[PDB]
Structures are given as C-alpha cells and as structure tokens.
Amino acid sequence: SMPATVAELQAEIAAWIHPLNPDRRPGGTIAKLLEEIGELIASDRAHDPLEVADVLILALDLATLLGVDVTEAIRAKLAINRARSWARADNGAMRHIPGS
Amino acid sequence: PATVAELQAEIAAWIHPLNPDRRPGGTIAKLLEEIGELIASDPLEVADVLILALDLATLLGVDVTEAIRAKLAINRARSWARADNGAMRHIP
Amino acid sequence: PATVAELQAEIAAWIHPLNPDRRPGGTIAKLLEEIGELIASDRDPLEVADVLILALDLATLLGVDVTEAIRAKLAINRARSWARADNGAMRHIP
Amino acid sequence: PATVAELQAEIAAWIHPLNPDRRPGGTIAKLLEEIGELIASDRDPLEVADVLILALDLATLLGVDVTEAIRAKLAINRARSWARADNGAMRHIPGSDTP
Ligand SMILES: Nc1nc2c(ncn2[C@H]2C[C@H](O)[C@@H](COP(=O)(O)OP(=O)(O)O)O2)c(=O)[nH]1
Ligand SMILES: Nc1nc2c(ncn2[C@H]2C[C@H](O)[C@@H](COP(=O)(O)OP(=O)(O)O)O2)c(=O)[nH]1
Ligand SMILES: Nc1nc2c(ncn2[C@H]2C[C@H](O)[C@@H](COP(=O)(O)OP(=O)(O)O)O2)c(=O)[nH]1
Ligand SMILES: Nc1nc2c(ncn2[C@H]2C[C@H](O)[C@@H](COP(=O)(O)OP(=O)(O)O)O2)c(=O)[nH]1
Ligand SMILES: [Mn+2]
Ligand SMILES: [Mn+2]
Ligand SMILES: [Mn+2]
Ligand SMILES: [Mn+2]
Ligand SMILES: [Mn+2]
Ligand SMILES: [Mn+2]
Ligand SMILES: [Mn+2]
Ligand SMILES: [Mn+2]
Ligand SMILES: [Mn+2]
Ligand SMILES: [Mn+2]
Ligand SMILES: [Mn+2]
Ligand SMILES: [Mn+2]
C-alpha cells in the first residue's frame, strides 16, 4: 500500500521486531526512541530519511505496546488542540493557554 | 484507519496557520517535552508524541511509508543483540 | 570555590519549597524539555544552566555522590576500548 | 567534593585524546541515549554518572562557566513565580518576574 495506513506500518514493524524481542516494553522503547532522536539531531546529512525512520519505527511501536489506536488518538487530540488557545514558546513550538 | 500521509496532512493543516515558521529544531524540542510527559505519566499523551514525530517527517520531506519500509529491510538483514535498556543494538 | 555538592545544595534550597514532593520522573521530564530548548536555540549559558540544574538535582534525588560517581565511571571508561559512533560520540567495544 | 570545573577538566582530559573534534550535537545525542538508559533502568549511580559526564562536557564545549551560569539562573528563578506542571516539575508564570 502507498501511502500505508498507520496500522499497517505498525504491523510491518511488529512483524520484524516480535521474533527478536517479543516481550519488549514501553520503557526500553522510549529509551531507544531517545537514542534515535539524538542521532537525528547529530545528523549532518541535509536529508536523512533513515534516521527519521528509526524515530518513527519506535514511536509507532510504542503505540502498539500501549494499545493505542493511532488514528483515533491523533484525531482526538487534534480536536482538543483546535479548541485550545495558543501562544508561541521560545523554542519555536507552541504552548496552550489555560481556560477553565 | 487513516494513512500516515492523511494524518500528516491533518496535523499540518492545524499547526501551519498557528505556527507558519515552524522548524525541525523547535519540533524536536517539543517532541522531547512530550516524551518527558509520557515518562512522568495514556492515549492522548502518546498522541502528543506522534503528532510531533509525524510533523517532523513532514518538515523534513520524508516519505514515511517508503522510509520505514527501507529501514525495516535494513533491519531484517542485520543481526541483533539485546541491550541493557531492553531494546536492541545491531551487531556490526 | 563552590563544589558540585554546594551547587546541589543551592539548587535544592531553591526548588524544595516550591516542589516539596519532587521526584526523579518529573525531573527527567523537565530535563528533556530543557535539552530540547538548548537544541532549538539559535545562540547560551542560561540554557546550559537549565540542563545542569536538573541533572545535578536528579543526582540529589537519587542519592548519588556526584564526584565519586563521575570518577568511578571515568575509571571504568578508561578500562574500555572505544569505537566512533555515527552521531560523533563514542560507544565502547564489548 | 570536587568543584564542577575540576570534574569538567577530568572529563575533558579523558575524552579529548579519544575524540578531539567532538561537538555539541553529538554530545547532546549521546546525552539523550544515557538519559534513556536511566529511564529504562530497573535499579543507579553509574547511570547518573553517564548523564552528568555528558552534561558537564557539553558545558565545556559551549564555553560555559557552570558555577556562574547556575547561580545566575537560580537568581532569575528566585525572582520568578512558579506553577506545578502535570509532569510533576514546575513552569514559571509568564509575566510574574519580581522587579
Ligand atoms: N506539530 C506541532 N505540534 C505542536 C507544536 N506546538 C505544540 N504542538 C502540539 C503537540 C501536542 O499535541 C500539543 C501539546 O500541547 P502543550 O500546551 O504542551 O500541552 P499538553 O497537551 O502537552 O498538555 O501541542 C508545534 O510547533 N508543532
Ligand atoms: N520497535 C523497536 N525497534 C527497535 C528496538 N531495538 C532496536 N530497534 C530498531 C529501531 C531502529 O530502526 C534501529 C536502530 O538500530 P541501532 O543498532 O541503533 O542502529 P542504527 O540503525 O540507529 O544505526 O533498531 C526495539 O526494542 N523496538
Ligand atoms: N563526554 C563524552 N563522553 C562520551 C562520549 N562518547 C561516550 N562517552 C561516555 C559517556 C558515558 O560515560 C559512556 C557511555 O558508554 P557507552 O558505550 O554507551 O556505554 P554505557 O556505559 O552507557 O553502558 O561513554 C563523548 O563523545 N563525549
Ligand atoms: N530541579 C528542578 N528544577 C526545576 C523544576 N521545575 C523547574 N525547574 C527549573 C529548571 C530550570 O532552571 C527552570 C526552567 O523554567 P521554565 O519555566 O521552563 O522556564 P525557562 O527558564 O526554561 O524559560 O526551572 C523541578 O521540578 N526541579
Ligand atoms: Mn539510527
Ligand atoms: Mn541507533
Ligand atoms: Mn545513526
Ligand atoms: Mn502532552
Ligand atoms: Mn506539553
Ligand atoms: Mn501532559
Ligand atoms: Mn523551560
Ligand atoms: Mn528557553
Ligand atoms: Mn530553559
Ligand atoms: Mn550508560
Ligand atoms: Mn550508553
Ligand atoms: Mn546502561
């Protein structure tokens, strides 16, 4: 499929990792995710799709381990984000402004 | 279930008007904040991490399906050892 | 001059009244936020300060003698062999 | 207890022969690896040591006087007001600087 559904990508990731690390857990997955984000930061390569892939392989598989429906969770939080008020943070991302 | 590209389009359509000069560096900064929240904590928190990780791919122009499949093909040909943190490291 | 233990004491004296039940998990979470800010910065001693304030306080919360722990791990590191990793740091050879 | 500058000097004297052209980017990358190890630990001082070795060497590479920088930021933090965040740490209240 092209583009694949996020669940199909999770399944392809899991088909690779499950024979090798069937009882992997969220904590070790987050630890590896931080390693791979580090590699992306340090990457001198103007384009590094394989380092982005490492980050996404772990983030999508984290969702699998936590039983999270990626489509439902992302759309539910985007709906929350649309209803929120926002201000820019110094790092260039945003932070929401509390209502009640 | 949505395609990864459709979720990228929905994320970008929300953040782009609010943050028109968003960059990979600030996206990575925020991603690290949200991973911290997950450590300290949960589907909506996982959502925060994925919203930022997928938008980083958008900003870097990475075809997610193609890149993940390419790296999984590399990972299949590698041999692996279990790391102390419970994840793996490939054997050089 | 002030030692790492004295900086830990100064940090603890500031944060403890504000966050009397602070714990390693939230401190690691805040440390990740501040490393992110350092990454995104376009400059930055005060962002480095934010990282070190949290990392030194993490050692305090975990009961770690910073001088002795650093010197003990450096001694382990001297006994290892090292390869250059793609990110520009090193990884020891098993 | 050693001064932070002395610990930085010992760290630098160890790593510089092995990695003389090391940079902040790779040091941050490794720092994140070692923080991850602390998160996943089912235990420890040597893991805390890995984090601090890299965070202090980062300060060296960026030319930061650690004692001066930490004291300057603590002074700023004392003048701020603070709210507790959901992760258990604090975030300063915007606009609350005591003048
Ligand atoms: N892609 C993208 N998402 C962003 C950016 N700034 C904030 N966000 C989103 C990511 C998360 O879904 C959400 C986090 O909101 P925030 O105020 O920390 O609140 P919280 O939801 O973590 O409690 O905001 C940004 O610059 N880019
Ligand atoms: N989902 C998942 N992926 C894992 C785990 N351990 C390793 N991986 C994958 C994520 C990346 O695609 C890859 C990283 O390999 P590694 O030996 O650091 O090498 P590198 O490819 O970063 O150079 O391995 C793990 O425990 N879970
Ligand atoms: N300052 C500095 N320290 C470095 C660098 N590359 C590796 N190190 C040190 C930091 C830690 O004390 C140690 C981490 O070793 P590693 O092979 O991951 O093994 P481990 O000790 O985490 O099991 O190596 C580097 O580039 N700079
Ligand atoms: N040790 C410790 N320090 C904390 C905690 N919560 C916040 N801080 C400190 C660390 C940094 O010096 C500072 C971060 O402040 P913040 O409101 O993100 O603002 P900023 O200084 O990053 O702009 O606050 C906390 O729970 N523990
Ligand atoms: Mn990688
Ligand atoms: Mn790696
Ligand atoms: Mn790499
Ligand atoms: Mn969040
Ligand atoms: Mn947040
Ligand atoms: Mn949260
Ligand atoms: Mn901050
Ligand atoms: Mn900042
Ligand atoms: Mn800061
Ligand atoms: Mn370590
Ligand atoms: Mn390590
Ligand atoms: Mn370890």
Point out the ligand 2 atom lying closest to the alpha carbon of residue B80. Answer: 17
* Residues in contact with ligand 1 (CB, 6 Å cut-off): A 77, 81, 93-96; B 11, 15, 19, 22, 26-27, 30, 34, 37, 48, 51-52, 55
> C-alpha angle C61/C30/C4, rounded to 5°?
45
The answer to whether residues B30 and A91 touch, using CB atoms and an 8 Å cutoff, is yes
- Closest listed ligand to the CA of C74: 3
| Domain boundaries, given as residue ranges, for chain B | 4-91
DSSP per position, D19-86? -TT--HHHHHHHHHHHHHHHHH----HHHHHHHHHHHHHHHHHTT--HHHHHHHHHHHHHHS-EEE-T
Ligand 2, atom 25: closest residue by C-alpha:
B87
Query: Solved by what technique?
Result: X-ray
Q: Nearest 10 degrees: CA dihedral of B22, B24, B26, B28?
A: 140
Residue corresponding to tokens 């991302």: A93
CA of B87 to the centre of ligand 2 (A): 7
CATH class held by domain D4-92: mainly alpha
Chain-chain contact of A28 with D40 (C-beta, under 8 angstroms): yes
- CA C45, CA C20: separation in Å to the nearest integer? 27
The reply to whether omega before A3 is within 30° of 0 (cis) is yes
**D-chain residue closest to C26, CA distance:** D88
Beta carbons within 10 angstroms of residue D96's beta carbon: 11
CB contacts < 8 A (A, C): 17
- CA C47, CA D1: separation in Å to the nearest integer? 25
The answer to whether residues B29 and A92 touch, using CB atoms and an 8 Å cutoff, is yes
The answer to whether residues B18 and A94 touch, using CB atoms and an 8 Å cutoff, is yes
- CA D39, CA D36: separation in Å to the nearest integer? 5
* Residues in contact with ligand 4 (CB, 6 Å cut-off): C 11, 15, 19, 22, 26-27, 30, 34, 37, 50, 53-54, 57; D 73, 77, 89-92
- The answer to whether the CB of B75 is under 6 A from ligand 2 is yes
**A-chain residue closest to B85, CA distance:** A28
Under CATH, which number does the domain A6-97 receive?
A: 1.10.287.1080
Alpha carbon separation from D54 to B13, D13, D29, D47 (Å, rounded) = 38, 13, 10, 11
Alpha helix positions (H), B1-92: 4-18, 24-40, 43-59, 64-77
- The answer to whether the CB of A10 is under 6 A from ligand 2 is no
Under CATH, which number does the domain B4-91 receive?
A: 1.10.287.1080
Bridge partners, C91 (sequence order): C83
**Torsions phi, psi for C16 (to 5 deg):** -60, -45
By CB atoms closer than 10 A (0-12, 13-18, 19+), residue D69 is buried
Alpha carbon separation from A29 to A35, B43, D13 (Å, rounded) = 10, 16, 34
Structure tokens at D34: 């070692």
Contacts of D49 by beta carbon, 8 Å cutoff, 6+ apart: C64, C69, C70, C72, C73
Q: For ligand 3, pick from C66, C74, C77, C82 the residue to mutate: most ligand atoms within 8 Å of CB.
A: C77
Chain-chain contact of A42 with D33 (C-beta, under 8 angstroms): no
Chain-chain contact of D2 with C4 (C-beta, under 8 angstroms): yes
Q: Residues of C with CB below 8 A from D37's CB?
A: none
Structure tokens at B15: 């953040």
For helices D66-79 and D45-61, give the axis angle rounded to 10 degrees: 100
Q: Residues of A with CB below 8 A from D37's CB?
A: 31
- CA C43, CA C14: separation in Å to the nearest integer? 27
- CA D17, CA D79: separation in Å to the nearest integer? 43
User: Which architecture characterizes domain C4-93 according to CATH?
Assistant: Orthogonal Bundle (1.10)
